[PDB]
Curated annotation (Swiss-Prot):
Name of the protein in its database record: RNA-directed RNA polymerase L
Gene name for this UniProt entry: L
Amino acids binding Mn(2+) 2: 52, 79
Protein family according to the UniProt entry: Belongs to the Bunyavirales RNA polymerase family.
Domain notes: The N-terminus contains the endonuclease activity (endoN). The central region contains the RdRp activity. The C-terminus contains the cap-binding region.
Amino acid sequence: MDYQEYQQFLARINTARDACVAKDIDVDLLMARKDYFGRELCKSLNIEYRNDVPFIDIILDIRPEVDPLTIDAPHITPDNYLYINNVLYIIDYKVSVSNESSVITYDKYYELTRDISDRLSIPIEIVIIRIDPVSRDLHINSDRFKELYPTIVVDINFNQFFDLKQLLYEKFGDDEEFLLKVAHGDFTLTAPWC
């Protein structure tokens, strides 16, 4: 965390009169909780910090001798990557308390990446790192990634984030439109006109 980000978030919550701004604060807080997790985990993973790096850039980095025009561009935007022993991990970061999104993202990545994996004839994998905000547990599905990194410890906390989220939710607790917005994703749709 940081003092300046705390100050600007507090000011944004106080400024909020509508529900669109409240939903924007909610989603930007949640992405901040994701960026902080990714930053700290990378700090502790001995790896470079990436953030939604394009897949074509990953292919260019691992093997720059290939033509970057014959390569198809998949819709995937991998969060981080890692190449070792002609083995490629598509690193992701999730702060979800359930595997409900984790498995969805893993299956989407598999579907979108197996074709390119087989056209280059090189072993690539997908790694999902799920952390519970309430308890800092690390969940990894990739067996080989677990073998690669069996000893990782994290020293983070989610007290500032929890407090700010609750302060926003108690400021807008009585609002119906805000609750209807936060019940779903970032594409906000107001109550029906009929």
